[PDB]
Structure 1
C-alpha cells in the first residue's frame, strides 16, 4: 500500500532517505494488534479512528480527552491518515489530566491496568503500549514500565524533551522498555530530544501532523510524537509476524536506518525507525 502526500514522519519510516512524501506499508496495517495509548485520553469519535478507538479506563472525572495530546499520539499510532498502523485497535487509558499532567502514582496504576486489561481483549497479533509521558527519575515508575513489558506488552516510552541524558527521566530510563528519541525532517536529532545510552531508537518527532480534539488536526513536536511512531511500527511488525512484544524493540533497532541522524552525541544510538517494507 502507498499513502501519497503522507505526513513526513510516515514517509520517513518507510524510506532509507529523508525527503520523501509517500508512506509505503503492507496493507495488513496492524490489523489484529492492539495499542494502548496511556495519555490524556482519546477522542474515539474522531472520524480518523474509524471506530477502531475506544476508551477503556480513566483516572479522572471523565474519560474525555480535554487536552488533545492523547488524541494526537493515538492518531500517530493508528489513525487512517496520520497513523503508522492504520488498522490497529486503539485503547485509551487516561492517566493525564486535561492540562497534560499526571501524578506518578496514577501513571503507575494505568500501566498496571494495561497489564491486566489485555487479558479481557482479543489481540491476536499482540499488544503494545505507547507512553508519551514522564518526568524525572523514579524507580517506581521504571518498575511499573518494566512490569508492563514483562507482562507481554511492547512498551514504547518517550525519551523526554530536555535536551539531556534520558538516564534522569522516567519511564525513559527503564532499560527493559523501548525508549524513543525524536528526529526532524532533515534527519537531525530534534533540538529538544533527550539522548543517552538508554535510548533504543529514534522516530519522527518534530512537526508531526495528527488528530486533535474537536475532530480536528494539528502539528506538534516532542518525543511524545516520536513514541507512537515506534509503537505503531511495533504493532505493524507484530501483525506481520516479524517480531513479538518481547523482541520488537530489538527488532526495530536491528532493522533501523543506521547512521542517518545528525547531532547524535557520543554514547547514543544513531538508529531511526524503519519498516523495511519491500512491495
Structure 2
C-alpha cells in the first residue's frame, strides 16, 4: 500500500485538508538530490539540475529527494513540485550548486523552498541567496541539521542558521526531540522527523529519520497556509507558523515548539 508519515496528523494537516485546503496552486521547490518523478504517487511539475555529473533532476540516485518530496505531498497533496537537484548520488553537493538551485527558485517564482540539507560553514553568497529569496517573497525552509549538541554551542547548520531561514528540528511521535536534532538559538520550530515513511525511488515506500524529514512537513504546511490565503506574504506565512506552535521544551532545543497547521492557517 502506502504510508503517510504520522507527522501529517501530528502537525494537524488533516483539518486543513478537511476545510478544503491542500496546497493547491502553490509552487514548492525541493532543493535536494532530485525527485524520482516516475513514482505514481508523485507528480513533479518541473525542476532543474545543478549537479554537473547528474543532468536529470527527475532521476534520483540517492532516494533522499523523492522521500522528502513525498512528505511535502503528504502534507499538501495538491502542491506543485519542482525537483531542484543540488545533491548528487552520494548525498552531497557544492554550495555553489545549492545557490544555483536557490537562484533558480527565485527566478521561477517558487512560493516555497525546502532545503533538507546543510553544511558546517557559512557562505556570504549562500547567505545572500536565501536573503534574496525571502526578500523576493519565497518562504524558505531548511533542515536544522542532525548534529546533536555540543555544550552551549549552536549545532544548527547552513543555511538553516541564517535568520532569513526557518530552521526545523525534529520530534518523534511523542513530541520528544530526536537525539540527533541540531540545537541552538537559530532553531525555529519543530516537526516530526523520526521514522517518517514516504515515497522512494521505484514504486516504493520507506522511513527515514532526520531534520530532513522534519523540514518538508513545515514546507508542505506553508503550502497549505498559502492555498487558504494566497494573498499572504511569506513573512505572514512564516509568522503564523512560528506563532502558533505547540510549545514543547526549552527553546535552545525545541525552538518555538511544534507547528500546528490548523492554527497557523487561521
TM-score by length of 2: 0.88
Decide which of 126, 141, 144 is 2:129's aligned counterpart: 144
How much has 1:142 moved relative to structure 2? 2.4
C-alpha spacing 1:217/1:267, structure 2 compared with 1 (3 Å): closer
Aligned residue for 1:96, secondary structure, equals: coil
Normalised TM-score (structure 1): 0.84
Paired position in structure 1 for 2:161: 173
Question: Contact 1:31 / 1:239 at 8 angstroms: preserved in 2?
Answer: yes
Aligned length: 252
Give the structure 2 partner of residue 238 of structure 1: 226
- Specify which structure has the higher proportion of helix: 2
Distance 1:6 1:92, change over 3 A: closer
1:269 to 242, 249, 255: 255
- What is the deviation of 1:42? 0.8
Specify the SS of the correspondent of 2:67: helix
Distance in structure 2 (CA, Å) of the matches to 1:66 and 1:6: 22
Residue 213 (structure 2) pairs with residue 219 (structure 1): no
Counterpart check, 1:14 vs 2:12: yes
2:119 equivalent in structure 1: 135
- Picking from 89, 96, 99, the partner of 1:98 is 89
Partner Cα distance (1:181, 1:267) in 2: 8
1:80-113 deviation line (CA, Å, top 9, x unaligned): xxx1011110001000001111011111111111
Conserved? CA contact 1:138–1:170, under 8 Å: yes
Relative distance call for 1:168 and 1:158 in structure 2 (3 A) is: closer
Specify the alignment match of 2:31 in structure 1: 38
Q: 1:150: Cα distance to partner?
A: 1.4
CA distance, structure 2, for counterparts of residue 208 and residue 101 of structure 1: 21
CA contact (8 A) 1:42 1:55 kept: no
Task: Name the CA distance, whole Å, in 1 between partners of 2:159 and 2:44.
Answer: 25
The 8 Å contact of residues 143 and 174 in structure 1, kept in 2 or not, is answered as no
1:203 match: 191
